[PDB]
Amino acid sequence: FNPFNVELISSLLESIDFSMYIEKLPHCQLVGHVKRLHPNTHLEVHNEKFEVSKMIGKGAYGSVYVGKHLKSGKKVALKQERPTNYWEFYICLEIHSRLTSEQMIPSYAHIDYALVGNNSSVYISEFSDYGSLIGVCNKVKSVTNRNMDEYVVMHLSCQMLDIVDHLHAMGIIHADIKPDNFLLMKPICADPNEVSLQLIDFGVSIDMKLFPDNQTFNYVHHDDLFKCIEMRTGRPWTYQLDLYGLVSVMHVLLFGRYMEVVQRSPSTIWMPKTNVPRYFQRTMWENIFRTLLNIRDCRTMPNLQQLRTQLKCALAEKEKYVAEAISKFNTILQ
Structure with missing residues (x-):
């Protein structure tokens, strides 16, 4: 399917x-x-008027522009796509319909306004002054000439896990999780639980509530970089696709490089090709990567909250350092 x-x-x-x-x-x-x-x-x-200011991205079937809702002063992203992407609007409406947590509402892109023509759609959502995790990751490396600090990555990973956990609880698979699709909306607080990230771009998301219980898929991305583990091994998948994407994002943050996945010879276990440095919280990161990459079947997913617990425990061992690292990170952001 x-x-x-x-x-x-x-x-x-x-x-x-x-x-x-x-x-x-x-x-x-x-x-x-x-x-x-x-x-x-x-x-x-x-009745709402918007300035359309500057191009952000421009592809074969659309573009993204930054602008502003004049009445609010609210900076917005305008996303245009051909043909009209009704599906993206559907997913976003459902996400915000199914949400219950006050905590999680800012964690998912909200389509404030939709202009829907015969030919194309334009969806207007909140713009972030800090940009995506890609832009942040690269700016940090540009300024410090070092990778993002390990403990800052733990903090961001804990947040991303919380966002994905709540998304899956609503029966939605984002299906294109990558560093580009988390925006940093505000600086980090020392408390691992307030969310500063937002998941965006639900253009190819999957609503499991539209399928029978026990539905699985076995479609395979041709591109090997985006092949999750099940796609590489002739196996069905559902939520594993997002959990694979999650690891790929953690990998970019930790290492400054994109994830290549291989079997840990001579095991049948898949891990990133990159060795976590011994001086990192090696056992912890290896636990996280192994758990999220190697899932038995579609019937039961790994406990994402247990992974958050592991990260919080590591963060707790060095509270003073972490506050300093977060402080330094936020300063780079300004």
Whole structure:
């Protein structure tokens, strides 16, 4: 089964009368034709006017621009895609419909406004002055000429685990977890539990609530870098795809390099090719990587909270150092 299938997606949205729903939402405007986003212009969704300022990214089937909601002063990201990505709007609506935790609401991108044309969509969400984890990771390395501090990475990993855990509890697989898809929304606090990260870009996410209990998938990313362990080994997967993505992000933060996964010869166990330095919290990181990469079946996922506990315990051994490291990290962010 391939859960990214365009015709399946159309079928699913039609099965729940999605168009009839979004036609009623005051923050969604249906239009005939959506203009291509262009720098230094303005855009309206109903009564709300936005400055469209600068290009962030521009691909074959869309672009991202930074702008501002004039009334609020709120800096926004404008994401344009062709053809219209109704599915992304659906996932985001469902996430915010299923949330209960006050703690977790800022942890997921919210589509503030939607302009939906025959040809393309534009989704408006919050812009971060600090950028994605990629941008932060690279800025830190640029300034310090060192990798991100191990304990700062533990703190961020604990947060990412909490965000993914709550997402999976809602029956949603993000399906494209990478350092680009966590934004840092505000500086870190010394308390591992307040979230400063936000997961974004639900454009290819999977809603498990639309499938039977016990549904699995066996679609395989052709690209080997994005192949999760099950895809490499002729096996079904569900939530493992995100847990693989999670490790890949932890790997980039820790090492400044992208993750390559191999079997730990002569075991059948998959681990990153990179050896965790002995002076790191080696046993802990190896536990985390092994647990998240090597899952028996789709019936039971590893306990992500137990992993958070492991990280908190390590953070607790050096409270003074960690506060200093966080302080230094936040200063680099300014």
